[PDB]
């Protein structure tokens, strides 16, 4: 659902903090992508609940960070 190459580049740019000339299996990046999208969808569900609780349909960052706090992130 995210584009494949931009996410792969982001995974390279994060990983190069922890090790250098690190290599990735083609399916390791895909496992990261699908775990990330599943995590974000579940977070947007908790956000939409927090928005609805404020009598409000538009989600706002205070809703994301409430959901994250209540989840204990």
């Amino acid at each position: 659902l995210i584009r494949k190459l931009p996410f792969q580049r982001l995974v390279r740019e994060i990983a190069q903090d922890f090790k250098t000339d690190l290599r990735f299996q083609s399916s390791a990046v895909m496992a990261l992508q699908e775990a990330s999208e599943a995590y974000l969808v579940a977070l947007f569900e908790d956000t939409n609940l927090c928005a609805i609780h404020a009598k409000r349909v538009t989600i706002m960052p205070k809703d994301i960070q409430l959901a994250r706090r209540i989840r204990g992130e």
Partner: protein, 74 residues
């Protein structure tokens, strides 16, 4: 730089898949923040599994071991 590779329509799709009706313009940056730390918390552990193998390639097994650890701490 590259976190802007996670584009506004892609986040909008992820939110509409989550059932969100309307999204304020501040959410995209906030989403990029929470995604960025999530990847950091997973990839870092994956790289400690690879280093323990003395490997130079991160495998899908290392990713799923990292994910099952993060999910256990999550």
């Amino acid at each position: 730089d590259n976190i802007q590779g996670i584009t506004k329509p892609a986040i909008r799709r992820l939110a509409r898949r989550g059932g969100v009706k309307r999204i304020s313009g501040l959410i995209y940056e906030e989403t990029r923040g929470v995604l960025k730390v999530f990847l950091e918390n997973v990839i870092r552990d994956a790289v400690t599994y690879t280093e323990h193998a003395k490997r130079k390639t991160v495998t899908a097994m290392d990713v799923v071991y990292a994910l099952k650890r993060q999910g256990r701490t999550l």
